[PDB]
């Protein structure tokens, strides 16, 4: 939940974009 | 939305959903009206009874989602607030009077199928679509039963009547006034719904019939629980504001 | 300027599962 | 991996990535063993001195990836541990011996061109491969700086020659033991590489050239700086702490 | 069983760009 990233949803993990 | 519907690809492309950078979560919906302004409820931003108050900078900006929880790659945009501006008659004090609030983007939007600008009315338009009987469409991703507290997982459309001005302040106990208007079948009218938490900013749009071009007429300020009979949802009446909305976009 | 014409409805030229509802509350 | 190079896709099946899931944030390796079993580095889940203990629970096992941010949709296969075992005589306290952890899921992983197990050595092929001089392949999305505290933006391969019991005991302070081994260039052969932080766990194999298949010889486990001039990579002794993992491995 | 058996490559019979570098090594 964190820094440039964002959440997507399978294993709630953060994408970095 | 309480009662609501799928939407459809690609059919409402103004559709702004704002991001709580953190904990990553929604917070409200919002309208594309230009390449770089954006428009929601003030009391998103502010709402000092909640401690609510946040800057152009604890918002992300989503265009052109569908789902909620899904991060769509090469289709939805993200961006980030310049600036942001809540009307200063907005009455967080008492009934939520003038619950407009503008955010400018860092940078302009890209439009593809799914990012696109919604018009405002004109003092023309607004006075022949806004009439109790006709039917405005409401959108978004918050919750779906007045207490489920769940939520939708794709965007959701519902389309209510505007109601007649005492049914609404007969329907409530609040100080309704000249900036708000109220939507929705009466207590007997066999159909239901309504918007809900969580679907605060999202555009209350109306089709019109002549240049036949969706325009704005509401913005989901407030309400009283979700969907409940003989009451009804109040939006905060853009056209009304239209001069404040040219003045900031101005200068 | 161009608003509130939708790329995949109003240009295509194709009408959205419920609008035909709106626009017949008018009048 | 310091002094690496960039992974080719579908280079290195076993490869497991350790992640926090709060801070969600990258923790060690681990490398595919079997279809639920999985084998990191026991220091990755516990180190009193760091105050590091963590659970089946507060960590993901993301298997099959390359991009060590992007979330690898269709390709990568998150998974969750059902219980983690850390070898016995695991020493914290003194020189991180017996650095060995197996973690097995609670559900088998499906095989993809990206997720495919390696196998450990037998008292022949772990005897015959063992031997200085010879290459063995490194691989992590830690630290590419010794001090950079950056990081790897795709999986980092990097080969380097297993080094001399002496050697490696001349080349540091702490105690070594049968179960630990160096790798790494000696600072007189005009070619570099380490592995360093963020990269424990990660899988330290050589390709047999007898049956040609890739071996698991080594973890990574510890070292003194990255990419140091006649300083070597510390990796646990697999062949030699074998028995206990195919012991674990029945119940 | 299958194991150490790349997909991409040992199957396909094809060599990654540095584990001859590796061999060469051994012996
Ligand atoms: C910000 C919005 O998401 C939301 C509106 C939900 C719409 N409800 C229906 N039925 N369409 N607003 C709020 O919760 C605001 C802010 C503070 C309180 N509030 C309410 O809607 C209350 N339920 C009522 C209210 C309180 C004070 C002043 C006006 C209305
Ligand atoms: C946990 C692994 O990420 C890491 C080793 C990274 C590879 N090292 C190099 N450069 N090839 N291990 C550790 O951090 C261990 C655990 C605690 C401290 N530690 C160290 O490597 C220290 N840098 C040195 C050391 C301290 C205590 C006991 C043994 C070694």
Same mark, same amino acid.
Request: net charge neutral; charged share 30%; proline share 5%.
């Given at each position: 939940?964190?820094?440039?990233?964002?959440?997507?949803?399978?294993?709630?993990?953060?994408?970095?974009? | 939305?309480?009662?609501?519907?799928?939407?459809?690809?690609?059919?409402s492309p103004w559709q702004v959903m704002l991001?709580?950078?953190?904990?990553?979560?929604?917070?409200?919906?919002?309208?594309?009206?230009?390449?770089?302004?954006?428009?929601?409820?003030?009391?998103?931003?502010?709402?000092?009874?909640?401690?609510?108050?946040?800057?152009?900078?604890?918002?992300?900006?989503?265009?052109?989602?569908?789902?909620?929880?899904?991060?769509?790659?090469?289709?939805?945009?993200?961006?980030?607030?310049?600036?942001?501006?809540?009307?200063?008659?907005?009455?967080?004090?008492?009934?939520?009077?003038?619950?407009?609030?503008?955010?400018?983007?860092?940078?302009?939007?890209?439009?593809?199928?799914?990012?696109?600008?919604?018009?405002?009315?004109?003092?023309?338009?607004?006075?022949?679509?806004?009439?109790?009987?006709?039917?405005?469409?409401?959108?978004?991703?918050?919750?779906?039963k007045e207490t489920w507290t769940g939520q939708?997982?794709?965007?959701?459309?519902?389309?209510?009547?505007?109601?007649?001005?005492?049914?609404?302040?007969?329907?409530?106990?609040?100080?309704?006034?000249?900036?708000?208007?109220?939507?929705?079948?009466?207590?007997? @009218? *066999?159909?239901?719904? &309504?918007?809900?938490? %969580?679907?605060?900013?999202?555009? +209350?749009?109306? #089709?019109?019939?002549?240049?036949?071009?969706?325009?704005?007429?509401?913005?989901?300020?407030?309400? @009283? *629980?979700?969907?409940? &009979?003989?009451?009804? %949802?109040?939006?905060?009446?853009? +056209?009304?504001? #239209?001069?404040?909305?040219?003045?900031?976009?101005?200068? | 300027?161009?608003?509130?014409?939708?790329?995949?409805?109003?240009?295509?030229?194709?009408?959205?599962?419920?609008?035909?509802?709106?626009?017949?509350?008018?009048?």
């Open positions: 939940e964190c820094p440039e990233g964002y959440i997507l949803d399978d294993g709630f993990i953060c994408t970095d974009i | 939305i309480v009662e609501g519907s799928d939407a459809e690809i690609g059919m991001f709580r950078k953190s904990p990553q979560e929604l917070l409200c919906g919002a309208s594309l009206i230009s390449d770089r302004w954006v428009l929601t409820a003030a009391h998103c931003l502010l709402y000092p009874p909640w401690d609510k108050n946040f800057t152009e900078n604890d918002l992300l900006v989503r265009i052109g989602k569908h789902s909620r929880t899904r991060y769509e790659r090469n289709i939805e945009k993200i961006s980030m607030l310049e600036k942001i501006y809540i009307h200063p008659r907005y009455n967080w004090r008492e009934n939520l009077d003038r619950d407009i609030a503008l955010m400018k983007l860092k940078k302009p939007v890209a439009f593809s199928d799914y990012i696109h600008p919604v018009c405002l009315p004109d003092r023309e338009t607004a006075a022949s679509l806004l009439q109790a009987g006709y039917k405005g469409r409401v959108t978004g991703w918050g919750n779906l939708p997982s794709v965007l959701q459309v519902v389309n209510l009547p505007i109601v007649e001005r005492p049914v609404c302040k007969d329907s409530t106990r609040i100080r309704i006034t000249d900036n708000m208007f109220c939507a929705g079948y009466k207590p007997d @009218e *066999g159909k239901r719904g &309504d918007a809900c938490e %969580g679907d605060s900013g999202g555009p +209350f749009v109306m #089709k019109s019939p002549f240049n036949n071009r969706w325009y704005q007429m509401g913005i989901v300020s407030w309400g @009283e *629980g979700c969907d409940r &009979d003989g009451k009804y %949802g109040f939006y905060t009446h853009v +056209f009304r504001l #239209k001069k404040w909305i040219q003045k900031v976009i101005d200068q | 300027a161009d608003c509130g014409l939708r790329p995949l409805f109003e240009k295509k030229s194709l009408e959205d599962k419920t609008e035909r509802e709106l626009l017949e509350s008018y009048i």
